[PDB]
Design goal:
This protein is mainly beta. Helices cover 7% and strands 39% of the residues. The chain has a single domain (1-98), classed as Cupredoxins -  blue copper proteins (Immunoglobulin-like, Sandwich), CATH 2.60.40. The N and C termini lie close together (11 Å). A 5-stranded mixed β-sheet has the order 2-8-7-4-5. A 3-stranded mixed β-sheet has the order 1-3-6, with no helix packed on it. It is globular and about 35 Å long. It contains 1 helix and 8 strands; from the N terminus they run ββββαββββ. The structure holds copper (II) ion. One of its GO terms (cellular component) is plasma membrane-derived thylakoid membrane.
């Protein structure tokens, strides 16, 4: 089963929910653009390789509530991601693979 997260809380708050999700080795995650546009979802090559992290790093630029993105986690790690330009707050989230 893939996991999914929505870019900002229903009510209209920055914080991602669920902030962490679990996913399998080679399963997907989908991010759905809710609200508080523009979003990016930039992934840090923190304890994971550059290429992998880069492919997983959505440099994509979601404003329209509709354009979701997907990423595959081939390697069983933890990935951490953040939203650079998105005004200060601390858009923390991280995915955990099985
Ligand atoms: Cu954001």
């Amino acid at each position: 089963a893939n996991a999914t997260v929505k870019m900002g809380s229903d009510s209209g708050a920055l914080v991602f929910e669920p902030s962490t999700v679990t996913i399998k080795a080679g399963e997907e995650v989908k991010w759905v653009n809710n609200k508080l546009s523009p979003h990016n979802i930039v992934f840090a090559a923190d304890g994971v390789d550059a290429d992998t992290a880069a492919k997983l790093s959505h440099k994509g630029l979601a404003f329209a509530a509709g354009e979701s993105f997907t990423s595959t986690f081939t390697e069983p790690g933890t990935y951490t991601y953040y939203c650079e330009p998105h005004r200060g707050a601390g858009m923390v989230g991280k995915v955990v693979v099985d």
